[PDB]
Amino acid sequence: SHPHPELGRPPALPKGGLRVTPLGGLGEIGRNMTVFEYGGRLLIVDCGVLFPEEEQPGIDLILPDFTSIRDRLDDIEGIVLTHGHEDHIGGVPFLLREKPDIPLIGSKLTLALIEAKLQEHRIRPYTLEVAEGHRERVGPFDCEFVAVNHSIPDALAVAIRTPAGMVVHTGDFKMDQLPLDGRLTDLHAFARLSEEGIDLLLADSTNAEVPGFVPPERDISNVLRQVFANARKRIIVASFASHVHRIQQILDAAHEYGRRVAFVGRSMVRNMGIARDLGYLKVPPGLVVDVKTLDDLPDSEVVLVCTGSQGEPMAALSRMANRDHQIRIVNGDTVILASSLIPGNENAVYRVINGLTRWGANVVHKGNAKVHVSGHASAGELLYFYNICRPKNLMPVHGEWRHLRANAELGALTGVPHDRIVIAEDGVVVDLVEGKAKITGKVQAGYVYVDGLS
RNA sequence: CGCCU
Ligand SMILES: [Zn+2]
Ligand SMILES: [Zn+2]
């Protein structure tokens, strides 16, 4: 059920066939990168980083291994970026460093985030801004973009038409039926595509073991309002700097309860700056202020929105927990971790929670309140989605082995034949020839470490 | 299930 221990290098790609090679994101969540080959030309979908398991000096970021494309960088027609999360765009500066003029293709918000990051590397990319419904030809790859709801706005899936057929890549997605911006995962589009014929579907496996459905994001508002309604002093809320809709709900609550909001921490100030500037984050006049003014306000009128929900030791929340921040936690402070607890950050996160608790804060988190919902489709949604797409072949992506296997089982339950479901690992080469996907070889795909200079 | 600075 797993790829053969000694697959060799793949054979020549038959004329009229398509080659699909995940270089990252399989067997380990992160550094997502998938290479598509047709007629000697390459299309890359996503290029992320992976964060190490507690690894000390010498190791900051982990990259996909570019060895299999490095001697044919001139064949790359473009890099499609499904959405602006670091495990999908973090690797881009390191790829462009080897060939700077590879066009970036993505939504407005996605491009604003990757351009912000690139500016620090002194790199100005060529870009093609796309939106849902746009269809564009990139060399031999005919690309159509489809809206998907996720935990960051402006995420996209892509359908890639070649003479080998149509491949659909979901990116990361779920299916919130009441999204804050009204932007649904576009099931009409997926239905139409399925009637044309989806020959190969690559689908997000992150939440495939979780039965049932993701609760809508907007339900978090009720919990926030309760917490705000009952907080008598300062409120401090930590979230990922990219979760615009979560932060939106925080501002709405603050507004409702007569509080003002300051953003704290480099990432948060930067991203919320961009979201507000471009209109993804809706901010009423008078609500957001500079943190320096909060001293002059009564505690009961204060909300700090800050960074460090994963216990990152340099982020704001951890420094506050360790008495090493401008903001000093006092008895009666309310702290909300409006976030997931990513498997493996448990020790860091609990260390922060315990620190905060020691200084007398009331700490609200997903363990004692519903202040977070997953950004990825659950088993129930995946069944809906497969019943709509009816793919002729299925490749689960974006998951550890337990995730990929569970996703494959869901596919099988909806009627995808078992011989048309392929579970790949990083570096495994899959060929779509005459409508059928088969594993045909493997390339080098180990870990590559980087200190900013690699 | 994506950082943070
Ligand atoms: Zn992801
Ligand atoms: Zn994501």
Residue numbers in the entry: 2 to 455
Reproduce, without paraphrasing, sentences from the article in which this PDB structure was first reported:
The ribonuclease RNase J is a key enzyme in RNA turnover and precursor processing in the model Gram-positive bacterium Bacillus subtilis and numerous other bacterial and archaeal species (1–9). Thus, in addition to the eponymous β-lactamase fold, RNase J bears C-terminal and β-CASP domains. RNase J can cleave mRNA by either endonucleolytic or exonucleolytic mode, with preference depending on the 5′ end of the RNA.
The structure reveals a homotetrameric quaternary organization that unexpectedly carries intact nucleotides of RNA at each of the active sites. This pre-cleavage structure, solved at 2.27 Å resolution, provides details of the interactions of the RNA with the catalytic site, including a network of water molecules which may facilitate acid-base chemistry. In the course of preparing the recombinant S. coelicolor RNase J, RNA originating from the E. coli expression host was found to co-purify with the enzyme. The RNA was also sequenced and identified as 5′ pCGCCU, but the remaining 3′ nucleotides could not be identified unambiguously. The 5-nucleotide sequence fitted well into the experimental electron density in the substrate-binding tunnel that encompasses the active site, but the electron density was not clearly defined for the remaining nucleotides to the 3′ end of the experimentally identified pCGCCU sequence. The RNA interacts with both the metals through the O1 and O2 oxygens of the penultimate phosphate of the 5′ terminus. The water forms a close contact to the phosphate ester oxygen (2.7 Å). It was unexpected that the RNA would be found in the catalytic site adjacent to a water molecule that is apparently ‘activated’ by Zn binding, and yet not be cleaved. The reason that the S. coelicolor RNase J/RNA complex is stalled appears to be related to the presence of 1.33 mM EDTA in the crystallization condition, because we observe that EDTA inhibits the activity of the enzyme in this concentration range. Close inspection of the active site shows that the scissile phosphate is not properly aligned with the potentially attacking water molecule to permit a bimolecular nucleophilic (SN2) attack.
